[PDB]
């Protein structure tokens, strides 16, 4: 369900998606990141055909994060037609996420 992005696929997979893309900038060594990961898996299904959950590991793809000024992780960037609509930093709960999306959608 979730889209595993790379630096080279980010432009076309995210910026030119034209649909609803929630991106999660994460790292294997971040405690909070490990927390929202399970959540996102559930959000992907429930919002299938309404939103697209994509993840970008910042150790593996060091080029994209800087362009967005990431200062903390996990970072949730909700892209709409190639632009940043909403934004949220931190391991939200299943409820907090449902609210973030439902609202911003």
């Amino acid at each position: 369900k979730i889209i595993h992005l790379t630096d080279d696929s980010f432009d076309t997979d995210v910026l030119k998606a034209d649909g609803a893309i929630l991106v999660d900038f994460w790292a294997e060594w971040c405690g909070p990141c490990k927390m929202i990961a399970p959540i996102l898996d559930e959000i992907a299904d429930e919002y299938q055909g309404k939103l697209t959950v994509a993840k970008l590991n910042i150790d593996q793809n060091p080029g994209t994060a800087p362009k967005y000024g990431i200062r903390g992780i996990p970072t949730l960037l909700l892209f709409k037609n190639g632009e940043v609509a909403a934004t949220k930093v931190g391991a939200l709960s299943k409820g907090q996420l449902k609210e973030f999306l439902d609202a911003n959608l």
């Binding site: 971040c30 909070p32 060091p62 903390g72 949220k88 930093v89 391991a91 609210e99």
Partner: protein
């Protein structure tokens, strides 16, 4: 004998006013203060002590008070004033000789805190005086609601300053008597505070006379400075700066930037167990924030934790960064340091081998980058860079502690002119060429001066030959000047080539271990105990020398010091480095008396020391001197005279090995190597 000290408005380089001075006369047992308008009288009292053939005691007077008074007398009173060398005693010079195992703050230029070991108390008080006077000044000001500026405490004379001047003399006197109570340097049967200068020098240990002459000569060398080619170094700086940039561009392309945890306060705890996870990065739990009612543009949400991070760019000067990237490339560290980090120096880097050919090539760029920074920091960007120290007269006036090392060797600093890159190293020729007599134009004719570079020949090996003559009857010494000791050591060590021997011996004398020894030994590092064993076996005199040195120091210690060529005690730090201590100390003392005699001989030949004269000492780097000469004819005379003085020194101390010097004439340090 009188003890004195002065207070003036600035360091020697820019002093213009005498503020006050104090004199304690042993013959009257009294202290007399001299205020600004008593300057002439102050000078008269010092010259009266000289007329009586007396002694004037200063603490650091050789480098400061004495030349300062000459300068000040000329500027303020139009008077010619020159205290003769033989009438002056310096307790700092005396302290550095008698307490040669202890460090000092070099009169407040070095912070006491970073210095290892203990510090002699009175000398510590003297070195802190300027800082303490400053602190008083500042708090006395604040009391009056006034502001404090740069170093305004030295602009005008005041009574607090007078009180500190008096304190310096009470402390200097105390220091003087404590040093004078060392029977090893001063025979107890003589009251040295009650004798003429000639008696003081002849009745005390030779080391005392030698150290004062060395500090007097080197003080002048500091005043002379080393002609420096600023433009040439500013251009080298542009060249190195562009190469540094290009290497940075190439490296940050090969090794991309990454993210690291930073700014976290709260410990991350397992959400299930609640168990603290110290190994995980720190986090920050947003105090406020919510989803939405007008949506909340805020990105944070109360309760939802996150890991604060920073973006870090690859830094070639970071061994940590280099260590991280090379391992992520497959490098498995073979040797680590005592703290948990793997060794990342030019040697290991030279042996690293990774798969990716690009990252493999990036290693050389990294080694180049490090060497470039080393040059940039030393010549331009470092705190003590040459470009920050070049004075208005176009010269760098490096400082020298004439007896800074335990062995009797001198130490150099601000900047250290004893660590200029050699011609045999990258950019060495350009660095070296920037220091030279050619960069000084004659004050009258405007013509460049010439440089005379002279160094003692194989001094270390001859000192060894000397001390082993008692065991081999001059054999080793005989081979040095009439055969080939390098082939001789080669055979004794069983080493391959003759060049292996030069590396082995010079290394054997400067420490080194079996690893370094066995290293160039063809290759086979380690197991270099065989080479270092077969050697001492076929050169029994050396082993014998070592045995005698030990029977003198141990059994717990019988004695913790070695007697130097001039009688001084030379603290031995380790029974294993004892022979080294003995040899380095002898080389140091030979070279010290040598530069002294060389200058005395030039002066007895009619040559004047100074830029307004015939020659000028520019640098003394252990076993070599660089001297500036007005003409080539003078350069040749200096070269010849340095050889005579070296031979005079060898004869002076009955050396069992003939001592020699080699001299080269040219425009700068690069040509006089």
């Amino acid at each position: 004998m009188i003890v004195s000290d002065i207070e003036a408005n600035a360091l020697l380089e820019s002093v213009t006013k005498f503020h006050c001075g104090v004199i304690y006369d042993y013959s009257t047992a009294e202290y007399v203060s001299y205020r600004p308008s008593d300057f002439g009288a102050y000078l008269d009292a010092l010259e009266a002590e000289v007329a009586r053939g007396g002694l004037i005691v200063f603490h650091n007077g050789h480098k400061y008070d004495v030349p300062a008074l000459t300068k000040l007398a000329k500027l303020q009173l139009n008077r010619e004033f020159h205290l003769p060398r033989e009438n002056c005693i310096d307790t700092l010079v005396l302290s550095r000789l008698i307490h040669s195992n202890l460090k000092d703050t070099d009169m407040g230029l070095l912070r006491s805190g970073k210095l290892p070991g203990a510090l002699e108390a009175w000398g510590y008080r003297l070195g802190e005086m300027k800082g303490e006077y400053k602190d008083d000044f500042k708090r006395m000001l604040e009391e009056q609601g006034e502001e404090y500026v740069d170093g305004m405490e030295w602009w005008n004379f005041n009574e607090e300053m007078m009180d500190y001047n008096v304190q310096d003399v009470v402390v200097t006197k105390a220091l003087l008597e404590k040093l004078l109570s060392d029977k090893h340097y001063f025979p107890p049967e003589i009251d040295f505070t009650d004798v003429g200068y000639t008696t003081f020098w002849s009745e005390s240990l030779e080391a005392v006379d030698i150290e004062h002459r060395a500090a007097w000569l080197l003080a002048k060398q500091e005043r002379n400075g080393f002609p420096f080619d600023t433009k040439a170094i500013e251009e080298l700086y542009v060249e190195l700066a562009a190469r540094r940039s290009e290497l940075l561009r190439k490296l940050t392309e090969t090794f991309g930037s990454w993210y690291q945890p930073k700014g976290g306060t709260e410990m991350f705890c397992h959400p299930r167990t609640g168990k603290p996870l110290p190994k995980y990065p720190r986090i920050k739990t947003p105090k406020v924030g919510g989803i939405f009612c007008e949506l909340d543009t805020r990105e944070y949400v109360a309760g939802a934790p996150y890991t604060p991070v920073e973006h870090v760019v690859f830094n070639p000067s970071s061994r940590d960064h280099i260590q991280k990237k090379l391992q992520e490339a497959g490098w498995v560290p073979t040797k680590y340091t005592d703290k948990g980090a793997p060794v990342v120096d030019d040697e290991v880097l030279e042996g690293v081998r990774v798969d990716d050919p690009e990252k493999q090539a990036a290693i050389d760029l990294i080694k180049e980058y490090l060497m470039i920074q080393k040059r940039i920091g030393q010549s331009a960007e470092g705190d003590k860079a040459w470009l920050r120290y070049v004075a208005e007269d176009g010269k760098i006036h490096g400082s020298v502690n004439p007896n800074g090392a335990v062995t009797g060797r001198a130490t150099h600093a601000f900047p250290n002119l004893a660590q200029i890159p050699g011609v045999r190293s990258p950019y060495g020729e350009q660095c070296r060429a920037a220091f030279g007599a050619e960069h000084h134009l004659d004050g009258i004719t405007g013509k460049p001066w010439v440089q005379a570079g002279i160094d003692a020949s194989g001094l270390e090996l001859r000192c060894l030959a000397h001390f082993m003559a008692r065991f081999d009857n001059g054999e080793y010494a005989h081979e040095i000047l009439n055969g080939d000791i390098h082939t001789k050591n080669q055979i004794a060590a069983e080493l391959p080539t003759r060049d292996n021997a030069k590396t082995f011996i010079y290394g054997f004398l400067y420490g080194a271990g079996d690893e370094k020894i066995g290293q160039i030994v063809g290759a086979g590092k380690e197991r270099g105990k065989e080479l270092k064993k077969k050697f001492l076996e076929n050169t029994p005199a050396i082993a014998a020398l070592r045995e005698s040195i030990q029977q003198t120091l141990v059994e717990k210690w019988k004695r913790r010091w070695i007697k130097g060529l001039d009688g001084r005690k030379v603290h031995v730090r380790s029974p294993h480095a004892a022979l080294n201590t003995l040899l380095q100390s002898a080389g140091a003392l030979i070279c010290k008396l040598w530069i002294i005699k060389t200058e005395e001989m030039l002066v007895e030949k009619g040559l004047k020391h100074g830029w307004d004269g015939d020659f000028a000492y520019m640098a003394w780097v252990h076993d070599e001197i660089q001297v500036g000469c007005r003409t080539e004819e003078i350069a040749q005379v200096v070269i010849e005279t340095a050889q005579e003085a070296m031979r005079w020194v060898g004869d002076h101390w009955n050396f069992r090995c003939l001592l020699d010097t080699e001299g080269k004439m040219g425009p700068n340090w690069a040509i006089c190597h």
